[model samples]
Target chain A: ARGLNQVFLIGTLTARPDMRYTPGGLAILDLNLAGQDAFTDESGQEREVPWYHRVRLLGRQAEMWGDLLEKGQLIFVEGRLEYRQWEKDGEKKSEVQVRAEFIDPLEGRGALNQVILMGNLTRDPDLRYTPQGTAVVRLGLAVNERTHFLEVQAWRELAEWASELRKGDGLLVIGRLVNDRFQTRVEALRLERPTRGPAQAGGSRP
Target chain B: ARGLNQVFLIGTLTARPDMRYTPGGLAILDLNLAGQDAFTDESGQEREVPWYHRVRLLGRQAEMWGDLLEKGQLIFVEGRLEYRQWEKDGEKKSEVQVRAEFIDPLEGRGALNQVILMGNLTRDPDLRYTPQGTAVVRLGLAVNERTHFLEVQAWRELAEWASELRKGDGLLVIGRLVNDRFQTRVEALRLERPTRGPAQAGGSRP
Candidate 1:
């Protein structure tokens, strides 16, 4: 019978990723993630706890840009749950992991992984060029209150579009979360300055 | 800031539920679930893996009818993921769990949890009465191919309607998955005999 298995996580990388290659030369990346939630306990007192997860990514994209990832980067991930088992020292061991399907760096706005964040630019966007001459830009985003400092990446046309934004500018970012070896970041699917009319630049809502 | 944490799982219970009550007298049920999926590995060989999850449910419903659930029952669960922590002895410990919001015992067909199952009744449904005199019915639903023999529950009006169904009849069940101390089952919201005109008895597709 057909079954369903899907997972969505938003969190920060706990450590830098460790990249490895298979015998056939395919790239694989592994990351550790941490997320926290607040809730009321049986005694009716508010408490917060952190959840940790192991995530893995495979294929060309991970191999190409894996080294640029850093620790403590905030990210969101969309993937399916996978259970793996193997023999270790004559014992059978099993663990569950998320196998990523899509990764995005968050900055400015559009909807990716159903996340929308409005924040101030922590620094001016940095435009860079790949060896193949592809345009890429990196941005620093800061949202107050919970106060997150997130890294975001934009590519090609979007990279050019984000180049004009300056530090302290209010922005609305729509993107997906991607995890590299050491960090979690947003891959901008769309980036734009916050609407200019009367709407206040606000934080993410869900 | 607000965040979203949700999970959906369809699987079979590994054992019978152990029912308990909180100090505040709220009913609580715990369950072990096992789900399986097949995928192609990096070497392009098809492989199947089993994932295990711990699920929790709370409320009067769990306390009242939890004992009726059994081992090997198949179900669907929709809930928010929760991280719980406490001090144990001299050490700190944490675990991730699903705090179930909706549970369904899938015996027949359903649109709940975005799942639809069409299968043959393995046996005639048994109509029973709760201590409060509410009508309840238990059913054995068997889907071919994947060959899942799942327990399904119907309550009140639906219980009365399902009592008349016989073995070998085709049924459609819609519901959410719920886990109790020992088993998993569908808490059906809708159950109906399959249409007989010309539609083939099709298996689940996604």
Candidate 2:
């Protein structure tokens, strides 16, 4: 039978992320997330409850950008629930964790699992080349309220274009969460640094 | 800051629900849900994994419809991720569970969280009144392929109209998930039953 198991959460990071490496050298990161729910009780009194979630990220991107995340930062997480079980002192125990496929600083929002943000660059773009010499650039984005910081990546011609952008420049990003088994990161399909006047959409490089 | 946490799942019940009551005599029920996910592992081999969830329901509707839900029945659940913790043996432990706001049988297809189903009625509609004398009706929907069943409710004039439906009749439901303090169920805003030709949508009763 066809099934759907998807989760979307917007909350604050309860602590800074500490990245660890697996014996096989895969980078893994764990984060604590805090969220809130408000509703009226049966007695007609309004109440707000705090919810906490454990999120896990695996891959190179997560490790490379993990340091940019800090305590009390608001983040939007898109992922699926994963149930895990183990034995402790002959007792079986189980818990569910969010296996994040995408993580972004919630500067603003968009459609389901899709995030769009307009912010200023926190640092100059870091451009590099792949083994095949394809252009790639890593960017740091910051918004307000200590402005959430987001790690963004661009590729090919866009990477070349983004490398030309300076720190503190305003940028707009549009992307979706992609989990390539190793890391959960935003594969920015579009990136724009609007100047004066109407902003133009970013183009896809061949 | 406000946050959003939502979950959508399609799966099957692992057992029959047994209705219980709280100290205040509010109806409560618990159900076990099982689902499956198929994906390719690092070794490049496709694999299927099973997931289980515990669902809790509250109020008269869950109690009344509790008996209809049986083991192995497929269901689609829509709700939010909730975290609960307790102290056991002087140790703190926590787990994540889905608080279902809507339950339905996926007889067909849909886009995103919106569900549309067309199926046959399994039992005659049971009409009743609220303490305020508002009309309400309970419906049992059945679909083929081992025959999945869903419990649905309607209110006011729609309740009166649903009451006229008989067992073995056909129904088309258009509704969204709603969570009351006590339970999660579909608050159907529209319903229909087709005839020999095109079906007519049911109008709301005053």
Candidate 3:
């Protein structure tokens, strides 16, 4: 059989999500999720351990999700395999990430009260409209090990609701995967860039 | 991430194989294979062509295999998920046969040959004595398919040779998949007992 590149994960939102809109009028919510799996080792030792620190979404199809998703929410995600690289100081760092294609909320599992720092939502959301009249938002979601700043895109009724969300709002969102590219100029050099986010499409918020 | 269960297949064999014993007394052989894949549909539609078939050995642990195995032979096989069943007259009796672990020298592509069958050798293979007492030679191979005719078994050295085979063959044996149970036993009541010949394991031989 050929190798299949697919992933399915069910986990809890470790923090409130930060909402952001892409330049293209897509709503993007960046959230952190913790996933764990338990198994018996070869020596018959039982172990329950965390497996992933996922970066996920509230897409343009799910605009108000920023305000609807709170810390500690349980959700299921399905996505494709993806990898990216960045430079810190003078070193090169590479990491693999899931480009979400589906997201579902599991009732009664959301964060409450003030957001905690580790594995929690950080910063405020920036909501904006795309030139094509789509609503987009951006947010910074922090995991226990690292933080990822994400851009979520929303459209139609979801877009209208996303525009009304404020900092620390909790909600659920779902959408398909889309990528963005950008060019940056630093002191003496110019760089080419591409970003991972949900793209607006005609379908159920997949 | 879980336990691995994968299969790969190349092409069919082009000739008959010369079976021999390995240094540790294992049966071994090398085979000639030709694999081909097409990119276009039979209707002249465009498609990806996967045409990579080449010659490779069936067993490599022993060096003596450098000789046997011929050319231009076609073969078909059932394994891993191999299934065989039997039914009693009027009583509706059935059993799942699972021990027919491996076979070689398949007839035409998608067809079967009778040269290979699984069973224990009722006799002992000859030997070159060492300081140890006369070594016992016995072959035990269980063919998972149904066979009610001639009793088949590998003898003496052949038994040792059988053990050297890997859980699955490598290289040329790629792109293989398990049989779907539904299609295999369309008429469940007909297979009351095993038979010989290419139609059934251990069916016919001189």
Candidate 4:
């Protein structure tokens, strides 16, 4: 089965990122961050909690951003989870942390939210036209058969192309997630379909 | 505004990957793959379509997996989108390609479904206990200000810890998603809090 392992964080740093090197001399940077998220409780009290994040940056990424990191600075991290278990002083300890692929300062106008899924359509395409006559379609996509469903939206030429699709059809959809204060759904920017026959195309823009 | 950029692909190669060296001597591998996704259509018909993917492997990752990749082999990829546009022969062309951070074979048992969110709780926690005395709880979490909602599940000690959470409270949750023939929701494995009044803990398991 295909898998997903991505993590994005927008948080404040606790201190300067720790920089070091490997035996092979690859530069490495260690970061400790304070992440915040809030919600209302059962008793209707709004509250917030702090999350401590441990992130690492490597090579050019380390050198590029390590020096820019400062205490209490807001930063954005894009990475994947790396889980490890170890023994320390006769006690077994484990932690899951982020290994940053890209890190940047989270300043003035920024955010990160993404979902990538490869699945079959749980329902046929639902197409509609806006007053401007633009094409739009909604789809229900299912993944894993542990089976989760996500609503997907395709517009313009895509709406026309995918409008012909049916339930049980499989699609490789690339898109961004949107929450309209009502629901969380994916707005597809690209669509890839299963190969049929020998559907070869031309090469590298030549 | 939070942005989204993640890609997950399950595809087969059409030919051997091309390997090269950067002017600076970093190894790079370019892959042209054929990906598949299927669904049942409006008229109750099932079908599959092919999607072509352009993916790149860099430096050590190229060296590590270069020889292992082969034409016709299936692979799983984890990466972020890299969009580029250029003019060739007086014509403009654009592409959204992948810069792989991780890649693997689809030869054995595997799966990937992850969703990490930091949002406000939309409602009070719903806690319940199994006849076996196991605790399980459900929560509604909203993200960004666009405000999408995702159902979150916590069990055992987590259920105990999270049961104290309320609507409008903010939380940072680490979890995997599942769609059990009913709905897609997250199963939280970690709970990190917002620090209040010197909530510092001990260091690195020492």
Q: All models: lDDT?
A: 0.62, 0.60, 0.36, 0.63
> Which of the numbered candidates is closest to the native, going by highest lDDT?
4
TM-score of predicted structure 3: 0.27
Q: Which of the predicted structures, 1 or 3, would earn the higher TM-score when compared with the native?
A: 1
Regions more than 4 Å wrong, model 3: A1-3, A41-44, A61-64, A86-91, A108-206, B1-206
lDDT of 2 by residue, B1-206 (tens): 11233445556777887878889888877777776554334445577545666776667546555776768766655565454446673224543446666554432211122233446788899999999999999887764423445556889988998898889876665454434313334456566663322224658732
Q: What digit string (tens of lDDT, one per residue) describes model 4 on residues A2-102?
A: 33433466667889887888999899999987765442344445775446666788898887666656787766677754544557732245433467887
Residue B147 in model 1: shift from native, Å?
41
Q: What is the lDDT of residue B172 in candidate 4?
A: 64
Model 1, C-alpha of A8: deviation from truth (Å): 11
The order by descending TM-score is 4, 2, 1, 3
| Total clashing pairs in model 3 | 60
Name the runs in model 4 displaced over 4 angstroms: A1-110, A195-206, B1-206
Worst window of 10 by summed lDDT in candidate 3 chain B: B184-193
The CAPRI category of model 2 is incorrect
DockQ of the candidate models in sequence: 0.02, 0.01, 0.01, 0.02
Listed in order, each prediction's TM-score against the native is 0.29, 0.29, 0.27, 0.33
Cα error, residue A102 of model 3, in Å, equals 0.9
For each prediction in turn, the share of the native Cα contacts (below 8 Å between chains A and B) that it retains comes to: 0.00, 0.00, 0.00, 0.00
Query: What value does the lDDT take at residue B204 in candidate 2?
Result: 71
User: lDDT tens string, model 3, A95-198?
Assistant: 44565665555443111010111112245555677789766555433332233333344454554554554454332222222223331100101011011122
**Runs of candidate 2 exceeding 4 Å displacement:** A41-44, A89-92, A108-206, B1-206
